[PDB]
Amino acid sequence: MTDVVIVSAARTAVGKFGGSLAKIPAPELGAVVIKAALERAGVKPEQVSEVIMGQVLTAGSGQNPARQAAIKAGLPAMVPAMTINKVSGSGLKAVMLAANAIMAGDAEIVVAGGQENMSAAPHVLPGSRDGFRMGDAKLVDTMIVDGLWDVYNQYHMGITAENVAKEYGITREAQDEFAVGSQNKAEAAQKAGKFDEEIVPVLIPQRKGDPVAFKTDEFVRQGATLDSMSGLKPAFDKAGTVTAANASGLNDGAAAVVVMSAAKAKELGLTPLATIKSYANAGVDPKVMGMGPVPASKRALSRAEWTPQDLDLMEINEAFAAQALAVHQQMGWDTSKVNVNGGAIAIGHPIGASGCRILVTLLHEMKRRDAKKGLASLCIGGGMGVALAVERK
């Protein structure tokens, strides 16, 4: 059939919970990256066939957050858009959907990624429409129930990370060591300007002044040490191993890529960043959802006819050190090539955006080191994984 290529890539910086992006709605972050990614590609808004954006947390967001991002980015009304939710998989699954559509001949050019503002997620009042005839009622945190809580077992994602830690023998000390590594890798990449090219600024309005650009991954902890972690108390289970320091955060951000067939890029005179080599999803038991990247990455590698050793660089999302370590244990690949600029423990985890955020990061680093074969993969609440492989000439 047809090869799919990525012609451009952009992300916002990732905001801390209640931080610099907390008052900017997720679609407005999405618009920043859709607009930037098209500019970078040299593609006019009217040439876009569709926009697909992941967003998990949509309570009170208004009709179709992806359409809002597309319109706010300047795209004309003739360009249709769809919002998707595959939890942390969303941002990457959008690119997968774009590739399916191009391959099927349903679309020519697709802007795909994800957008999330966890800070702005509201509380919801279940049963409000009916009323509360007697007795107390509950205001439920949508960020938790819709973003972070397993339906089937009724406990937090952090408990799934405890389950994975026990199953694969991932100790508290190894978690913390992995977490310090991520922070120091991120600090080192940040301090050396390595995130400069991939980040586009978001202008934050200021009461009686000009807006200020936000363009730094403010969640990254500089000068992080093992000692600053090894004393912390477990966050989710009193006898447990997972802490605030060895899990990712609650974060805000967006990321997008522009996708088209290789034949279309050549028709337009565009040199692609990379070819999409393969992609795959996978399902696992919700109890061990952090393991999804294993069967997903294995399926993606098999579709690519690659081995884990053929890879030059990977981005494997760090929702929890416990799960990222188990994944590395089970894949057997070389971890000096994974998250070389740090991961989500340091950078943050805006759930519906991360899938494309890590792809953006992967592509920019590949180019910088002239890596030829890369993979991005993430675990997914409710027991899934997605993985996508890219190849450079």
Residues in 153-192 that interact with its own copies by CB under 8 A: none
Single out the segment in contact with its own copies by CB under 8 A; choices: 144-152, 187-195, 267-275, 314-322: 144-152
Which residue shows structure tokens 């205001």? 139
The contact pattern for its own copies, residues 23-62, with x = CB under 8 A and - = no contact, is ---------------------------x-----x-xxxxx
Cα distances from 366 to residues 13, 33, 341, in angstroms, run: 19, 20, 11
Minimum distance from residue 215 beta carbon to its own copies (Å): 24
Q: d(Cα 6, Cα 95) in Å, to the nearest integer? A: 9
| Residue among 86, 264, 357, 364 that touches its own copies (CB under 8 A) | 86
Q: What angle do CA 244, 247, 248 make, to 5 degrees?
A: 105
CB neighbours of residue 262 within 10 Å: 16
| Residue among 39, 47, 103, 237 that touches its own copies (CB under 8 A) | 103
Of the candidates 282, 283, 216, which has an alpha carbon nearest to the alpha carbon of residue 253?
216
Q: Which is nearer to its own copies, 83 or 248 (CB)?
A: 83
Q: Which is nearer to its own copies, 163 or 341 (CB)?
A: 163
For every residue of 224-271, DSSP letters joined together read --SHHHHTPPPSS-TT-S--SSSB----EEEEEEEEEEHHHHHHHT--
Q: d(Cα 300, Cα 307) in Å, to the nearest integer? A: 10
Residues 199-228 that bind its own copies (CB under 8 A): none
Q: d(Cα 95, Cα 93) in Å, to the nearest integer? A: 5
Single out the segment in contact with its own copies by CB under 8 A; choices: 122-130, 239-247, 251-259, 265-273: 122-130
| Residue among 147, 181, 293, 350 that touches its own copies (CB under 8 A) | 147
Minimum distance from residue 48 beta carbon to its own copies (Å): 10
Of the candidates 174, 143, 173, 170, which has an alpha carbon nearest to the alpha carbon of residue 156?
143
Q: Which is nearer to its own copies, 18 or 205 (CB)?
A: 18
Q: Does 134 bind its own copies (CB under 8 A)?
A: yes
Minimum distance from residue 60 beta carbon to its own copies (Å): 4
Is the separation of the CB atoms in 161 and 316 below 8 Å? Answer: no
User: What letter does residue 17 receive in the DSSP assignment?
Assistant: T
Cα distances from 214 to residues 29, 86, 189, 253, 301, in angstroms, run: 12, 28, 18, 11, 37
| Residue among 30, 113, 286, 352 that touches its own copies (CB under 8 A) | 286
Size of the site for its own copies (CB under 8 A): 87
| Residue among 7, 43, 101, 186 that touches its own copies (CB under 8 A) | 101
Of the candidates 212, 266, 6, which has an alpha carbon nearest to the alpha carbon of residue 113?
6
Single out the segment in contact with its own copies by CB under 8 A; choices: 132-140, 172-180, 209-217, 241-249: 132-140
Q: Does 112 bind its own copies (CB under 8 A)?
A: no
Q: Does 263 bind its own copies (CB under 8 A)?
A: no
| Residue among 31, 199, 274, 282 that touches its own copies (CB under 8 A) | 282
Q: Which is nearer to its own copies, 137 or 263 (CB)?
A: 137
Residues 221-260 that bind its own copies (CB under 8 A): 250
Residues 327-386 that bind its own copies (CB under 8 A): 380-384
Of the candidates 320, 300, 337, which has an alpha carbon nearest to the alpha carbon of residue 245?
320
Residues 64-83 that bind its own copies (CB under 8 A): 64-68, 71, 76-83
User: What letter does residue 334 receive in the DSSP assignment?
Assistant: -
Q: Which is nearer to its own copies, 180 or 327 (CB)?
A: 327
Minimum distance from residue 296 beta carbon to its own copies (Å): 9
Of the candidates 136, 103, 98, 118, which has an alpha carbon nearest to the alpha carbon of residue 26?
118
Q: Which is nearer to its own copies, 181 or 292 (CB)?
A: 292
Q: Which is nearer to its own copies, 5 or 284 (CB)?
A: 284
Q: Which is nearer to its own copies, 121 or 322 (CB)?
A: 121
Indicate the SS3 state at residue 377: strand
